[PDB]
Amino acid sequence: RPTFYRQELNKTIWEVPERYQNLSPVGSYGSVCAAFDTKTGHRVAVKKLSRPFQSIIHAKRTYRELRLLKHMKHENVIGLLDVFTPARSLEEFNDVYLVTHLMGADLNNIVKCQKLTDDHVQFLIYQILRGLKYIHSADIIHRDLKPSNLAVNEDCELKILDFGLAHTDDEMTGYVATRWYRAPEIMLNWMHYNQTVDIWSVGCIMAELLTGRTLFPGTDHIDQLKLILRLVGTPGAELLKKISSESARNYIQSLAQMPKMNFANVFIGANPLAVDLLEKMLVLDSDKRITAAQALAHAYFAQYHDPDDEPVADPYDQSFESRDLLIDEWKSLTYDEVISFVPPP
Numbered sequence: 428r429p430t431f432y433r434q435e436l437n438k439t440i441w442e443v444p445e446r447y448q449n450l451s452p453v454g455s456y457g458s459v460c461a462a463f464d465t466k467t468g469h470r471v472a473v474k475k476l477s478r479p480f481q482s483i484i485h486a487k488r489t490y491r492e493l494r495l496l497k498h499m500k501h502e503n504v505i506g507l508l509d510v511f512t513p514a515r516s517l518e519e520f521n522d523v524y525l526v527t528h529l530m531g532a533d534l535n536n537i538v539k540c541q542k543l544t545d546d547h548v549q550f551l552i553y554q555i556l557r558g559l560k561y562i563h564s565a566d567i568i569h570r571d572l573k574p575s576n577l578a579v580n581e582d583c584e585l586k587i588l589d590f591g592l593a594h595t596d597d598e599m600t601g602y603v604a605t606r607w608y609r610a611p612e613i614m615l616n617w618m619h620y621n622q623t624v625d626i627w628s629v630g631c632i633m634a635e636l637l638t639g640r641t642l643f644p645g646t647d648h649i650d651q652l653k654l655i656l657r658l659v660g661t662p663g664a665e666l667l668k669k670i671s672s673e674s675a676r677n678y679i680q681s682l683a684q685m686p687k688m689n690f691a692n693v694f695i696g697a698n699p700l701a702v703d704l705l706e707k708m709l710v711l712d713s714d715k716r717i718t719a720a721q722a723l724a725h726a727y728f729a730q731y732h733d734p735d736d737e738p739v740a741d742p743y744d745q746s747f748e749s750r751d752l753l754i755d756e757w758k759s760l761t762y763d764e765v766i767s768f769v770p771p772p
C-alpha cells in the first residue's frame with residue numbers, strides 16, 4: 428500500500444498517493460486535477476468521483492465505467508493508468524479516483540483554427556476508424572463520438588475518449604453540438620440501435636474536416652431531421668418497415684419525398700475517394716452503412732492501411748448489465764476491481 432497525503436483544493440479534500448505531485452484544479456460526475464506522476468514521468472488527469480454510490484443507478488454506473496476503462500488497451504483509445512482509494516477495508520470504502528494521461532487539444536481546436544490538407548484528413552479519420560474497429564470488436568458502442576471527444580497532439584496522432592456511459596433531455600434540446608453528430612434512428616428513437624450509429628458520427632466529423640463547417644447544425648430535432656433528409660433522401664418502403672413506432676412512421680410519410688443529392692456538388696473540390704467514402708457512411712438505413720473494418724480497406728486510406736497493425740480486442744463480458752443488485756453489492760464488486768488493478772508496462 429502506498430503512503431497517502433491529504434490536501435484541500437477549492438473546498439474539496441483530496442487524499443492521493445505520494446507519487447502524484449503538484450495537483451492543480453482543472454474542471455468539474457466528478458472533479459478533475461492535473462498532476463505530475465513521478466512513477467511514470469507523465470502529466471496526468473486525476474478524477475475524484477462525486478458520490479459514486481449514492482443510488483443503485485449511480486453505483487452501477489460507477490462499476491460500468493471502471494470495467495470499461497480497465498478493458499481498453501489500444502493506441503487510439505483512452506486507457507487507465509491507475510485507480511485508487513484511500514480506504515483500507517471494504518467497510519470504510521467510499522471514494523474512487525481514476526488516473527489517465529493528461530490530454531491537450533481536441534479536434535475542435537484543430538478544425539476551427541488550422542488549414543487541413545487532404546493528407547491530414549486521411550490520417551485523422553484513419554485513426555478514428557482503427558480505434559473503432561477495436562472498440563466494436565468487443566461489442567462496445569461508443570454512442571457519443573464528436574470533435575470535443577477526440578484528443579490530438581502535435582504530431583496529428585489521435586485518441587478517442589469520453590465513452591457514452593448512459594445524457595439528459597435538456598442536454599439534447601435546441602441548437603447544441605451534443606446532438607449534431609447523432610444518427611437519426613437514435614435521435615428520434617426509431618428502433619433498437621447498434622454499433623452502426625458510431626459510423627454515422629464519423630461521417631459527420633469527416634465532412635466537417637473537409638469543409639470547415641458543421642454538416643447538420645439543426646436548431647431542434649425536427650429541423651435537424653429535415654437537413655439530414657435533404658442530403659440523403661427520404662426513406663423508402665424497405666426502411667419504413669423497420670421503424671418500430673407507428674407514429675414516427677406516420678410523421679415520416681407526411682413529408683414530401685426527396686431524392687438523395689449529388690455529394691460531389693455538396694463537397695466541392697474534395698478528393699473523389701473521400702466523396703465515395705462519405706456516401707458509404709452517410710446512409711439512412713443503418714443495416715447498409717459501411718463498417719469500421721470495411722472502411723479501413725477503402726482506397727482513400729491506401730497510404731496508411733496495414734492489415735497486420737489494426738488489432739482487435741480481447742472478449743468483453745457485459746453480462747452484468749442485465750443483473751439486478753443492491754447498492755452494497757455493486758459497491759463490493761467495484762471494490763474488487765480497484766484492488767485487482769494491474770498497471771500497464
Ligand SMILES: Nc1ccc(-c2ccccc2C(=O)O)cc1
Pocket residue numbers: 502503528530531578579580584585586
Ligand atoms: N500512436 C499514438 C496514438 C495516440 C497518441 C496521442 C494522441 C493524443 C494525445 C496523446 C497521445 C499520446 O498517447 O501521447 C500518441 C501516439
Ligand SMILES: [Cl-]
Pocket residue numbers: 512513514519520521522523
Ligand atoms: Cl474511501
Ligand SMILES: [Cl-]
Pocket residue numbers: 535573574575576604
Ligand atoms: Cl463537439
Ligand SMILES: [Cl-]
Pocket residue numbers: 682683684
Ligand atoms: Cl411527395
Ligand SMILES: [Cl-]
Pocket residue numbers: 742743744745
Ligand atoms: Cl471480460
Ligand SMILES: [Mg+2]
Pocket residue numbers: 575576589
Ligand atoms: Mg467530452
